[PDB]
Nucleic acid binder design. Structure first.
Ligand SMILES: [Zn+2]
Ligand SMILES: [Zn+2]
Lengths: 37, 224, 52, 136, 60
RNA sequence: GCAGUCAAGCGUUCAUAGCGACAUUGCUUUUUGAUUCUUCGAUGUCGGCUCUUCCUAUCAUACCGAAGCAGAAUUCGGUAAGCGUUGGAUUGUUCACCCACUAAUAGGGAACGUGAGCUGGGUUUAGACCGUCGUGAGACAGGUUAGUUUUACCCUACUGAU
């Protein structure tokens, strides 16, 4: 029972997790620093 | 309401401040911006004190206080005790505790009526807590995190915990403390809510990265 | 407030200049050679770029 | 020093250099930390760098939770056994060199710290002070 | 300005002099000199060391 | 290896903001090649440790100028060599590669600095093993292993003392 704390609306689990899946998909990136060609 | 600020460049306010329903504490570190964020929404019935206990700026974690008492560790000196006593109302009694867990603000999550506390505190210290602050104590944990005053922010109107807290844990704790809780975060995912922010009955202060989704919960849980 | 007359006045000193091609020395717009010895008094000048 | 460090720390006797293995004091599942390098270090021929209390280092894990080890990560010391001096003249020393895992900005990885912690690190890193029960 | 007491010998410790020791259980120990500091590391008991306050107070 | 002039043309249309043809003049001895001029009745021959100084063709630092230089961040450029320019894995290694910090981890010289200064891992004696060649003794600039490193009390220099 938390809030997505970026958008707000997504009440997620307390298994140990962060802002909403859509929010981490669209805003957060962890593949930077590479050319794709 | 909830203000947002930074002590120097830190978004952690509960580390450098200790806010109650009758007094407040701050660290002497400049930033009149940081001091105005308290002076603004307050009256002269709440006196602010610029202090540094044990030669430290980490006062909100090294202290734990209420609206009628203040607990400080054995490492602070008579000079600081006296600057506090000559600058704080006489309605509170200050006591220099003499126990191991020097970080009182991490091991005590206190308000006017109830006090979550760390398990391994001495039985002669918990009784002093009850004596001074005038409070009943409970000693379990938050959700395995035994640092209650750091992983749980709390008032008499509302309470907040970190996002690992089970729903059974929330129900149990809300029943014991007799105030509704809710398990969110602050300053963009910072699970350390008892330190990343600080709250009163009619006031909260967080960091500039405390976004509006977090401020909404903070203004929903604590106003009531 | 911009005061475009004062903008044109300001351009006389920081924008209405030329630059030598070799030494990169700023020079007057009405120049015929560079006035520094080490370059060579070269008659190969260029104007300063204001736009873009 | 300002890799998320709040203020400026006074000098502390350089206790534990590279090659050192200090205990870990958090609940991150790591049981020791092998220092390899230091931040803010100075460069002099044949002087291997060193780390003092409060300092941030680069570390490797040599025991615990194999999803942690075989990679470099930042760490922060919280105890050392080399006797340093506070400006009130007193000398003091712990009995074990010990540190903590963290991210480069100063945020910890675990949730609590077993054992005591130095004032000279708690005043400098607030997140450390939040996760600490005992400060000296 | 405050004055401390050694944990081993019970000697007054003025500012500037002696080491200090923080054990793993956080119990803090002050040592006026290397003598008491090392007699602590050798696990000696002050109640058996003749020149200490604990000895002299138990012996009355 | 470095520099200068011509610069087809690439560089959102906008020959040098920048990169790059054809060539062309030409520099240093800090590179190979060539010579055989000095040493064949002793110039002790690799690298590393140490230590000092000098050069600038500036990696950073300081001050300036120009940029498809808003800011931020970068690039180029000018004086400028005052100060600094690392810890480590593998390798004998110079060279190289990689990890990490760092303001930076620039290039070079002094008999390819430096063995009566060290070391001796390597090369470069004799022992011995393998592979290939050879009928054979034996060869290999191929691999591997073991293998004595000398003297200063003189003159000068230098450091300090009368
Ligand atoms: Zn979301
Ligand atoms: Zn010129």
């Amino acid at each position: 029972t938390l809030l997505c704390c970026n958008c707000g609306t997504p009440i997620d689990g307390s298994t140990g997790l962060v802002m909403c899946y859509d929010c981490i998909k669209l805003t957060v990136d962890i593949t930077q620093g590479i050319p794709r060609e | 309401m909830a203000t947002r600020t930074q002590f120097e460049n830190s978004n952690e306010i509960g580390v450098f401040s200790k806010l109650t329903n009758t007094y407040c504490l701050v660290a002497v570190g400049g930033s009149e911006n940081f001091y105005s964020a308290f002076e603004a929404e307050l009256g002269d019935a709440i006196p602010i004190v610029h202090t540094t206990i044990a030669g430290t700026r980490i006062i909100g974690r090294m202290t734990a206080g209420n609206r009628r008492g203040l607990l400080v560790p054995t490492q602070t000196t008579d000079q600081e005790l006296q600057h506090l006593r000559n600058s704080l109302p006489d309605s509170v009694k200050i006591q220099r505790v003499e126990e191991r867990l020097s970080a009182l603000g991490n091991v005590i999550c206190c308000n006017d009526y109830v006090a979550l506390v760390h398990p391994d505190i001495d039985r002669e210290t918990e009784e002093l807590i009850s004596d001074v602050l005038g409070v009943e104590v409970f000693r379990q944990t938050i959700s395995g995190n035994i640092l209650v005053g750091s992983y749980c922010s709390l008032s008499n109107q509302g309470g907040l915990v970190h996002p690992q807290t089970s729903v059974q844990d929330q129900e149990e704790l809300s029943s014991l403390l007799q105030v509704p809780l809710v398990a969110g975060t602050v300053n963009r995912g910072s699970s350390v809510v008892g330190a990343g922010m600080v709250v009163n009955d009619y006031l909260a202060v967080t960091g500039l990265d405390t976004t509006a989704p977090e401020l909404s919960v903070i203004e929903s849980i604590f106003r009531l | 407030i911009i005061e475009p007359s004062l903008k044109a006045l300001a351009s006389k000193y920081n924008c209405d200049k030329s630059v030598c091609r070799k030494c990169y020395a700023r020079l007057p717009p009405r120049a015929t050679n560079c006035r520094k010895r080490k370059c060579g008094h070269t008659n190969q000048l260029r104007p300063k770029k204001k736009l873009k | 020093s300002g890799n998320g460090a709040q203020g400026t720390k006074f000098r502390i006797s350089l206790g534990l250099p590279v090659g050192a293995i200090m205990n870990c004091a958090d609940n991150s599942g790591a049981r020791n930390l092998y220092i390899i390098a230091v931040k803010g270090s100075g460069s002099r021929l044949n002087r291997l760098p060193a780390a003092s209390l409060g300092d941030m280092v680069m570390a490797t894990v040599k025991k615990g939770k194999p999803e942690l080890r075989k990679k470099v990560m930042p760490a922060i010391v919280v105890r050392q056994a080399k006797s340093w001096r506070r400006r009130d003249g007193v000398f003091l020393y712990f009995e074990d060199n010990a540190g903590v895992i963290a991210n480069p900005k100063g945020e910890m990885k675990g949730s609590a710290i077993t054992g005591p912690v130095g004032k000279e690190c708690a005043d400098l890193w607030p997140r450390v002070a939040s996760n600490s029960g005992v400060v000296v | 300005m405050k004055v401390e007491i050694d944990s081993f010998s019970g000697a007054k410790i003025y500012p500037g002099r002696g080491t200090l020791f923080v054990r793993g259980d956080s119990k803090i120990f002050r040592f006026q000199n290397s003598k008491s500091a090392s007699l602590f590391k050798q696990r000696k008991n002050p109640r058996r060391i003749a020149w200490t306050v604990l000895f002299r107070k138990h012996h009355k």
